[PDB]
Ligand binder design. Structure first.
Ligand code: ATP
Ligand code: ATP
Ligand code: ATP
Ligand code: ATP
Ligand code: MG
Ligand code: MG
Lengths: 485, 492, 74
């Protein structure tokens, strides 16, 4: 044809954005990865989504797994392929070998198979084809050049037939050659690499479109997660800087704080509370989560530092009854150890639950605990993710950060998140006469005026009481002022 | 079946959590690793727990070790296979070669072996199968493709038989290919990798479930230990943030402290005492452990810096008789150099002893010492483990930390654990008039009010005496203050 | 000895034969092997590791021009 290469949607979450529309129609895409990366799942979801969203029949050619198994496995994702096979929308071509045995039936090899796939295609009026582990086929006794030819032959016949195909390969090195024979890379029109990178005893699945002959696509690796719903990719670099921005205000749950912020936090905003350990970030969170219930709004408190029970003990000791918020179905507590997941996973759990609960407010107690282990770059990527999501969803977000050093801290954040944030509330210890008092300061607020004082404050059962500034002192920021008389 | 694959529990501690229930029934799981990683043990424990806990018979196929040796080595874990063989619950089928000699044993091999296996399975009504090192079978003269097919044949036949199987393979590189031929990884539906990673000159064993076709499972490496009870895995990432939390108070063993903490520590709480060397952390510990005996409760003191003798000399000089606490069976001391093991080992020793003694209190004198060498992330993982165990078990825990720099310390912890802790007790030196005095502060307390004073304190034979704050000083925290006040008293 | 002209599988069989006969005889044996890399495969043919009951690795590590010998029971 005379125009811009057309793409078939995969409907696999996030993939069509990365690929700028989908898989190129009528050509085949190589998808390779090491064991357990999700090659098989990709290729099934491509067919399954075809059938269920466009009523495009599919043909799935298997060389190793058994059709019963392919069917059985899909149940993991709540997909009835046996039904689809019955309705004639899906046809699983069994090309696996005889557990029993013979060695002279496939002397007509590529040729013959190519005929059965063409027969199947015509028969079911198939639009999508997935060949699972072509690699395993020549893993009979071949050399690079022999593979290059067979692959080419196949790709080509399928091109003639007009089918959009997904071919699956295996690799042994996460960052080594693209597929086993260092030859499939160049014979396909498109290449997709699925990686399961190790790094620190944790595993991180990343998808990459290495090339799409004829169109554009997003470059590099994007994290993804295999879940009950199959492959889920987050193109964190594909999120646009187009979030809605209002002037409406909301309370912090602490009136005086609201005053200092020139009448409260903005609804559309990301508020950061940083401070040495024990300064009271968690008390603010409690208070901010409570204010959303007293106004009959839903709030989620994602806790990564304290148990659901402890959170309740400490909250109740500050007034506020978290128990009720729970029943009233106005407040939802989560709680998990940063270590019980990858940032990718965490991010999704968060999104996920936000979707099931549709909160108005959200508080992540200790981003600084989520940064444990992870790389700064991996972590920043996470923050932009949760932040950006809350921002585009009109949810007001309160995030917490504990600074590594009490008193004398020379930066707002050790991970340098300040700037991705709209409002920064700052808590610090101040040594006043052999005692450790606290001080709160609205450091910055983007669309408002806010107070510039570093007010001292106390914590009682009643909660946070913000008092006055240390007017008669110098170097209050050092943590060790110098009362000047 | 219209159901997603079901799992068989291995009962191997920690494994069913990592594998979300067990191994997939009717399929085979490839377990591979280098020499001495624990392959053979995993497979034996899988059959053993199969028989002892569900009365599911097992067939163990062996290609290299002798049935007598497999039975003999299992005695290391208190397992009498010879008995089970006897009662027809376990059947070791010997597939090893005879120390004499025959050629061309590749063909009939698989097939014969397969019906030998089928025969045995059918014969004993086996539900579980372990094939130990299939690897060694084609290690007769083969190339990758021949391996791939043979494997496939075998797995397949077993699938047909309906057996849940554990297959074992060797590797030569800790992070190299999954299994010798670089082919087994793909033919198997499930793959488990046992690693015995070096580093320092210490070795750390990890288990990873790489893939389970059909279901979910935890990802990554998990440290485990081989013990007299076999493989023991700690899914430190599977521990849930659901610990019970009470408002009950308990004493620190120092009244004045108790006041400062708004009436003593919380029963449910992790306490951290920090400060430069010689401050008084060990003193606080001793006192905290004694307090649990004087109340006839059990306490364990895990010490990593002092001998059991030294602890006793120093204690007695502070009053408190550790001798009695011992006899009375209320106090138990441990002691061990951080270097005499890996964090994984230590964590387990701690847990183990907490189970045999059921303490109400526990103190680890110096986390800081356990951090010697180990990486920060390995360490933090350790702390969350001991910390969380303590917490879900309602045991009050006091941990100690020596800061790397006396005076001027700009962070509570050098390893940044402060966040993983409920109450923080800070000890510091204060230079006052050419002399080194001490100060104690309750830096933070999660559920109470605590005192914000940086009180000076002394240490005598009576123990710790907490005096008053340094009100007329600026830069207390810095360790080197400055006195103030420029108006004594004059006329009108 | 097999450094005469052999491949991995031939070595595994021969070793196994020897070790086996020795165990029958009732003897407690120490068998020595060479390696070329201080941290690579355990022994030459990457096969002796699994054929023996116990494995001990003697290392002589370089690192900064000094040499440090270590013994490990693997
Ligand atoms: N419901 C599920 N929830 C979460 N993870 C799942 C679920 N089902 C399967 N998985 C995961 O997905 C993986 C499946 O990968 P998959 O079968 O797609 O093919 P593959 O890894 O590409 O290739 P191979 O045929 O070599 O195994 C499993 O290893 C497992 O980690
Ligand atoms: N009932 C109470 N009465 C007086 N002060 C209290 C009370 N509860 C807690 N506090 C004070 O508040 C502090 C608790 O801090 P908070 O739980 O708000 O979290 P944080 O400082 O933000 O974070 P983290 O606890 O992880 O360091 C304690 O140090 C203590 O001084
Ligand atoms: N009771 C025990 N206590 C602690 N460690 C044990 C004890 N018994 C055995 N071990 C350890 O476990 C190891 C046994 O490993 P195992 O026999 O399970 O198989 P392998 O290493 O997987 O394979 P192979 O030795 O056949 O190459 C020993 O090397 C030893 O380190
Ligand atoms: N009988 C005593 N009388 C007066 N002071 C004592 C007595 N015993 C110990 N001390 C003092 O207490 C200090 C001992 O410190 P302690 O045993 O409390 O542990 P630490 O400071 O926490 O840790 P570490 O000893 O490893 O540095 C000595 O430096 C000394 O000044
Ligand atoms: Mg907190
Ligand atoms: Mg000490």
């Amino acid at each position: 044809e005379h125009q811009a290469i057309a793409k078939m949607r995969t409907m696999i979450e996030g993939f069509d954005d990365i690929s700028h529309g989908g898989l190129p129609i009528g050509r085949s895409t190589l998808v390779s990865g090491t064991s357990g990366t999700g090659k098989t799942l990709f290729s099934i979801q491509f067919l399954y989504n075809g059938i269920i969203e466009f009523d495009e029949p599919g043909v799935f050619v298997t060389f190793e797994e058994t059709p019963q198994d392919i069917i059985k496995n899909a149940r993991s994702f709540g997909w009835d392929l046996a039904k689809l096979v019955d309705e004639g929308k899906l046809f699983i071509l069994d090309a696996s070998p005889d557990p029993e045995g013979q060695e002279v039936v496939g002397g007509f090899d590529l040729s013959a198979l190519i005929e059965r796939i063409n027969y199947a295609i015509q028969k079911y009026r198939a639009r999508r084809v997935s060949i699972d582990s072509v690699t395993s086929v020549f893993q009979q006794y071949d050399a690079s050049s022999v593979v290059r030819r067979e692959l080419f032959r196949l790709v080509a016949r399928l091109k003639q037939i007009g089918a959009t195909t997904v071919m699956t390969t295996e690799r042994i090195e996460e960052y080594g050659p693209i597929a086993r024979y260092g030859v499939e890379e160049f014979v396909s029109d498109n290449v997709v690499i699925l990686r399961n990178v190790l790094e620190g005893e944790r595993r991180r699945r990343t998808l990459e479109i290495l090339k799409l002959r004829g169109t554009s696509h997003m470059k590099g690796e994007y994290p993804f997660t295999i879940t009950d719903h199959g492959i889920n990719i987050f193109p964190l670099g594909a999120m646009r800087l187009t979030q809605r921005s209002s002037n409406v205000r909301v309370s912090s749950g602490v009136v005086r704080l609201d005053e200092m912020c020139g009448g409260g936090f903005f609804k559309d905003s990301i508020i950061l509370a940083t401070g040495a350990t024990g300064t009271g970030k968690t008390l603010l969170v409690s208070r901010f989560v409570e204010n959303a219930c007293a106004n009959k709004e839903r709030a989620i408190l994602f806790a990564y530092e304290e148990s659901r029970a402890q959170l309740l003990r400490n909250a109740y000791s500050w007034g506020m009854d978290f128990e009720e918020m729970e029943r009233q179905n106005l407040l939802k507590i989560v709680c998990a150890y940063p270590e019980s997941a990858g940032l990718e996973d965490h991010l999704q759990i968060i999104k996920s639950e936000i979707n099931d609960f549709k909160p108005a407010r959200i508080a992540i107690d200790s981003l600084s605990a989520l940064a444990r282990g992870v790389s700064n770059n991996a972590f920043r990527q996470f923050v932009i993710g949760v932040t950006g999501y809350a921002k585009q969803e009109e949810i007001t977000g309160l995030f917490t950060n504990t600074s590594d050093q009490f008193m004398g801290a020379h930066s707002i954040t050790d991970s340098h998140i300040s700037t991705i944030t709209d409002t920064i509330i700052l808590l610090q210890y101040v040594e006043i006469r052999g005692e450790m008092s606290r001080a709160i300061n609205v450091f910055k607020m983007r669309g408002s005026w806010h107070d510039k004082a570093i007010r001292e404050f106390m914590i009682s059962d009643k909660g946070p009481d913000i008092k006055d500034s240390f007017r008669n002192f110098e170097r209050i920021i050092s943590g060790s002022p110098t009362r000047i008389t």
